[PDB]
Amino acid sequence: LDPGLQPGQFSADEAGAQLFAQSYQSSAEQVLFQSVAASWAHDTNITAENARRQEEAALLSQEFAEAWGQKAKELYEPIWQQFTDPQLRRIIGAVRTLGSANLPLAKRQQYNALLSQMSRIYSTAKVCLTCWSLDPDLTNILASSRSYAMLLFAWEGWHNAAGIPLKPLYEDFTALSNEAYKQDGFTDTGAYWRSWYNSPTFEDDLEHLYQQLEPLYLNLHAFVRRALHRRYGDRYINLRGPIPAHLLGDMWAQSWENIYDMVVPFPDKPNLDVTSTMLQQGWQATHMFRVAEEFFTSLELSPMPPEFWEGSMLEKPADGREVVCHASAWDFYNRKDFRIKQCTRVTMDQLSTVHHEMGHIQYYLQYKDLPVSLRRGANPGFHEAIGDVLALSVSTPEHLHKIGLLDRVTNDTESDINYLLKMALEKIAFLPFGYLVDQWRWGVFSGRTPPSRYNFDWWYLRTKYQGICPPVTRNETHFDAGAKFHVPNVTPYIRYFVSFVLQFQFHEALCKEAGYEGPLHQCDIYRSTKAGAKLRKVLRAGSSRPWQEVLKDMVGLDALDAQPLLKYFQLVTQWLQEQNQQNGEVLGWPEYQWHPPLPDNYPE
Amino acid sequence: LDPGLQPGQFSADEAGAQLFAQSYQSSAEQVLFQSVAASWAHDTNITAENARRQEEAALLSQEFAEAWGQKAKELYEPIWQQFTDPQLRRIIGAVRTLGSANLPLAKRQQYNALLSQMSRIYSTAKVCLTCWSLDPDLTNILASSRSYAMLLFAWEGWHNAAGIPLKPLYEDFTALSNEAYKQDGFTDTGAYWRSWYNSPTFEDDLEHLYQQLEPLYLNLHAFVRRALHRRYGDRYINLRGPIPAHLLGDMWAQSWENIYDMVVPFPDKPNLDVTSTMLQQGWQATHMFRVAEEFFTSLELSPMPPEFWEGSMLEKPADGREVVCHASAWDFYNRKDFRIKQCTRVTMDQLSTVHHEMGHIQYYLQYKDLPVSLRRGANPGFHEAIGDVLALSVSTPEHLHKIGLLDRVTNDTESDINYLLKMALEKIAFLPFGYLVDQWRWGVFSGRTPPSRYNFDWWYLRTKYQGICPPVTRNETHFDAGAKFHVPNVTPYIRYFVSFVLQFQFHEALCKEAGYEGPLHQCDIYRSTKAGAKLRKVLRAGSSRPWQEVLKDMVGLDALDAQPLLKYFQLVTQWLQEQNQQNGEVLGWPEYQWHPPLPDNYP
Ligand SMILES: *[C@@H]1O[C@H](CO[C@@H]2O[C@@H](C)[C@@H](O)[C@@H](O)[C@@H]2O)[C@@H](O[C@@H]2O[C@H](CO)[C@@H](O[C@@H]3O[C@H](CO)[C@@H](O)[C@H](O)[C@@H]3O)[C@H](O)[C@H]2NC(C)=O)[C@H](O)[C@H]1NC(C)=O
Ligand SMILES: *[C@@H]1O[C@H](CO[C@@H]2O[C@@H](C)[C@@H](O)[C@@H](O)[C@@H]2O)[C@@H](O[C@@H]2O[C@H](CO)[C@@H](O)[C@H](O)[C@H]2NC(C)=O)[C@H](O)[C@H]1NC(C)=O
Ligand SMILES: *[C@@H]1O[C@H](CO[C@@H]2O[C@@H](C)[C@@H](O)[C@@H](O)[C@@H]2O)[C@@H](O[C@@H]2O[C@H](CO)[C@@H](O)[C@H](O)[C@H]2NC(C)=O)[C@H](O)[C@H]1NC(C)=O
Ligand SMILES: C[C@H](N[C@@H](CCc1ccccc1)C(=O)O)C(=O)N1[C@H](C(=O)O)C[C@H]2CCCC[C@@H]21
Ligand SMILES: C[C@H](N[C@@H](CCc1ccccc1)C(=O)O)C(=O)N1[C@H](C(=O)O)C[C@H]2CCCC[C@@H]21
Ligand SMILES: *[C@@H]1O[C@H](CO)[C@@H](O[C@@H]2O[C@H](CO)[C@@H](O)[C@H](O)[C@H]2NC(C)=O)[C@H](O)[C@H]1NC(C)=O
Ligand SMILES: *[C@@H]1O[C@H](CO[C@@H]2O[C@@H](C)[C@@H](O)[C@@H](O)[C@@H]2O)[C@@H](O)[C@H](O)[C@H]1NC(C)=O
Ligand SMILES: [Ca+2]
Ligand SMILES: [Ca+2]
Ligand SMILES: [Ca+2]
Ligand SMILES: [Cl-]
Ligand SMILES: [Cl-]
Ligand SMILES: [Zn+2]
Ligand SMILES: [Zn+2]
């Protein structure tokens, strides 16, 4: 480690710790920058040379984290907890968690190589007969094809191509991660990930939320299953069994917005999927980011700086180059460079994803002047919820009208049910998946799910929560969890479940602050500088204060609460219940063993 | 209740509590007697009258615990914790746990009635094609038929006939039981059941034990699956998938000794299943119990008293009267009456069941002069292990020879493998099932497994631990867990897993104390008065002391330990590994979704 980057001496006391943290910050920005830079270079241009570079950068970071980690231990191990300065106890608390830097060098190199090989396998996998990529080709098939055999080929192809080769690496990664975090005092890596919510009752709290939300999901599921039955027939849809996992518009069945056209309650009201209009009008990626931005400035939040426009990758490269297409928002930790990397497609759901990603950037712009260790959301779920909250306003028929995407206006009970159903396809359908992913991963980290049951336990959870089944037989040579980006890329998931609850609490609060007094689901906070100021206080706080207190200042309550979500959706919750009873549906999937047959001429 | 049964007044201090506890136990014997008495009259004679009587007694019993529980909290709720006398602290801890008695009266009724209907449904269910009962007909089919289609009909018949009508009742029971135990401070009934082991780390401890044992089970499974493939063929056995749940000798696939004849590793040697010889020689139920008894008296433990021989039901009644055939051992809490109720069949596995049950009685005889509250095992696993320990000695080829059931065996490597394999079929195969039943039930009690997932979670666990699959499609109308006796009869199961480890610890201790020095698996403690004396000390102690301390005095360690089991089985564990490698077996069942097809014209 360069001399300039190494820790000096500090007193063993709180005044030393303050100088320590200032010295650290000087040197940490340079180290975070080189690492983020090498990551960007690789992810926007996957080559062996760029992967070698990212590996060395990652090793440099570990070296740093180890020297500054062991020094912070040596000097403040038994005294940091008693520091008067709360921001300082959290900075110190971060620095002395070494993570992967606890590993000896050989294992550190093995760890860094595993992350790089898993990322590469996921982001370069293809399905062939001439080969389809995930983004855009398979994405578009899952979204728009309504042919059982085509969707299946895409589903199976992807899960096989991405999952099967990840499995040996994922096992090795899991052992090393655990070894690393056990030397910071955690039983396993999952315990460390959960520690970020600083709540003793986290798992119980999540479970109590899910119990309130589950009836919504059960009713949506049944109603969608019925619409699937009418299209696909009795051979492929069991009205008392799980839904085949390739029919819901998305590779993971995680959001069902793309089958909206098959399930829309009242088809001669306004068409609320404005994708056709966007194409018809000639929208491109950069227009989508510009329109997101202008929402932010309408609140008196910050525009995207020049560095963002010059550096970002907003379209899939046409010049050959392999890239990681999975959308992401990047802080370079130099207070100057912030970028998005997205293989943006011109669709309504991508407009929402553009807002999601820009919400990440906006957080990074607002907390850029905190110490590096406090440059995070009050919890991870808060960072995931910012962009989603604005997208709630953008999605409204009134807002869409204002931005020229929805010529007709209507305010009647049918249009409202259409809108809430569309939104339930996006938000309610995701809840089970949001919850289950890290239940899977927590079991893997703890050792409850060994390699020999990775796929068995995955599908147990998928059926248990989402009420889906795999459309072809799977066995333990398959590694279907590995066909979802966040598993190989080691990104936690429970943030998204937290986010899907939190965003409705935020929405309700920002709507009331804006002076809005109509139904919660028709609120649009566009141009509300009051709403703006309230959101700004959250974004500026970073992780400098407990998330419970930041939440309480924002929404007046110190806990996750499903009530705002339930309220937003109440009309469609009631409507779906009534429809399902009148149709005589079975709620749930009591034929839990059922799987559909193979199509007759498959795949030939 | 009667006034003479309702509590006195007592000072709020340790001296009061000593008198209190004495006054409690005097009155509780009378109350336990009439309860157990009515239960007996019902189980050997299922009618509505007998059910009504049992219900009354249960109500009376709740009334008792109510009053005595109220009084114990009222008098000592703060202070009992700081009593010097540990034995007293345990008695008072128990008294203020009210259970079902926390229930309001109407729900007391309701709970008492669902038990009766669930018991009845299980024990009177039949399979018709002239109708087959579980015991003996379906038991015998599962044991000895080698026709895929007959076994299937029996398996599906039973699961459907018993399971399906239990489900609505089981749901109501579960809610009532949870409500009861929440008022004593347990999150749920499962947490109460588990409190019996007085161990913060119980669940972790069980899991750590299962991890050491699991390789043994995996090697046995693969070896047996291979044997079944040779027999049934590739259509019905997947060499990389779970074994169809009807093929292993038992309705629940829980122990596999009855397919021994199909898997025996060196077949030409003497037949270590002495069933043929027992029938040839004209053995009957009575003889089986008399031979068991005499093993106990060889140790200078107690003979069965006259009241046991006069009162017991040791055969299935031929008047036809509905009975609960499931074998059980009965303490009447009067220090006089002790009985077994068993529909005894003349087989070698029943001879072990006879010893198992007689182990319960021996316990009850040895602690009959204790305060009722100490009249249980040091933990429930202790009680389940006693008769099993003696049965391990009885099952040895040398012991069998001594009681005229087998010609002398050659003491060579092959006869040893044969024997250890038979014993693995009985003991190792049981381990997963022993562990999973209460995993299922704890999930139901905690709310993790709602009615809408009773069968899904059941089969998850079955496949996860036993590596079996249902041979016909099941859905949530089926309630396959209800087709196992202990579920409708609300009897915990984890005691059997604990027992199956404990028994090997005991066996090693008793063998060392007998002065035996050969292999663990060839020991016979028959006629060792020293071994007998050591077991007597355990049995006399009841639950007067922490099971950890009782165990330490007996065996040297203060915890459950798989090492004695591993050592008993070492030779066959090594052999099974080698067989499996040479056949190129896959250990486990990676084709986890696999289920067999239906046979051609079924039914
Ligand atoms: C779409 O339509 C709803 C319904 O509007 C109401 O019912 C219709 C059937 C007609 O009778 C309308 O005249 C009638 O307003 C609109 O929601 C309603 O908006 C108004 C405010 O804009 C709400 O009233 C306010 O109530 C607050 C206190 O809550 C008072 O302080 C205010 O003075 C004010 O009167 C009204 O409660 C609300 N109704 C519901 C069910 O929430 C909605 O605004 C309209 N939406 C769009 C997008 O135009
Ligand atoms: C596990 O499955 C693989 C993949 O086979 C496919 O998935 C199976 C679960 C089942 O649906 C099969 O019909 C599918 O072919 C099995 O390996 C393949 O086996 C096929 C056919 O048996 C064979 O032709 C291929 O070479 C194998 N590979 C591929 C690319 O399909 C595997 O044997 C199953 N069991 C185990 C333990 O992995
Ligand atoms: C049976 O023979 C063993 C010795 O032979 C070995 O172990 C057998 C179990 C069998 O598997 C053979 O093929 C083996 O070659 C006797 O064991 C010894 O006994 C003495 C006396 O206690 C003891 O000191 C030794 O340690 C024992 N050795 C072993 C192998 O543990 C065993 O006692 C014999 N018993 C009978 C029934 O004849
Ligand atoms: C597109 C989005 N991408 C993620 C990218 C996260 C990431 C972390 C670290 C290194 C690299 C990438 C994000 O921006 O949070 C995403 O994966 N998801 C999740 C998904 O698509 O699975 C859940 C989605 C909820 C709605 C908004 C988009 C959310
Ligand atoms: C036959 C035996 N019957 C049980 C009877 C239990 C019982 C408790 C309360 C009221 C009524 C019955 C017993 O003696 O533990 C039994 O069920 N099993 C269990 C079973 O057969 O499922 C597990 C067996 C392990 C070896 C010994 C026999 C064990
Ligand atoms: C992708 O990254 C590669 C590194 O693998 C970049 O390669 C450098 O590019 C130019 C010519 O292509 C040379 O001057 C360098 O010496 C290259 N290095 C190697 C190892 O070839 C490449 O330019 C990148 N592509 C883009 C468009 O950024
Ligand atoms: C549950 O299953 C019942 C019995 O048959 C089983 O399922 C049918 C569909 C066949 O596949 C058969 O081989 C199985 O053992 C059905 O009658 C019943 O409708 C099923 N569904 C429900 C909701 O109970
Ligand atoms: Ca779409
Ligand atoms: Ca989508
Ligand atoms: Ca048997
Ligand atoms: Cl997270
Ligand atoms: Cl128990
Ligand atoms: Zn995000
Ligand atoms: Zn027993």
Curated annotation (Swiss-Prot), chain B:
Q: Where in the cell is it found?
A: Cell membrane; Cytoplasm
Ligand binding (chloride 1): 197, 495
Which catalytic residues are annotated?
A: 357 (proton acceptor 1), 486 (proton donor 1)
Q: Name one GO molecular function term.
A: chloride ion binding
Q: What range(s) does the Peptidase M2 domain occupy? A: 11-590
Q: Where does Zn(2+) 1 bind?
A: 356, 360, 384
Give the recorded effect for residue 495 to Q.
Abolished dependence to chloride, leading to reduced peptidyl dipeptidase activity
Q: Which residues are glycosylated?
A: 9, 25, 45, 82, 117, 284, 411, 475
Top-level taxonomic group: Eukaryota
Coarse class of the primary localization is: membrane
UniProt keyword list: Calmodulin-binding, Carboxypeptidase, Cell membrane, Cytoplasm, Disulfide bond, Glycoprotein, Hydrolase, Membrane, Metal-binding, Metalloprotease, Phosphoprotein, Protease, Repeat, Secreted, Signal, Transmembrane, Transmembrane helix, Zinc
| Any one of the GO BP annotations | bradykinin catabolic process
Tell me how the protein is altered or processed after translation: Phosphorylated on tyrosine residues on its extracellular part, promoting cleavage by secretase enzymes and formation of the soluble form (Angiotensin-converting enzyme, soluble form).
What is the tissue localization of expression for this protein? Ubiquitously expressed, with highest levels in lung, kidney, heart, gastrointestinal system and prostate.
The entry sums up its family as follows: Belongs to the peptidase M2 family.
Record protein name field: Angiotensin-converting enzyme
* The organism of origin for this protein: Homo sapiens (Human)
Gene (UniProt): ACE
- Full-protein residues shown here are 30 to 637 of 1306
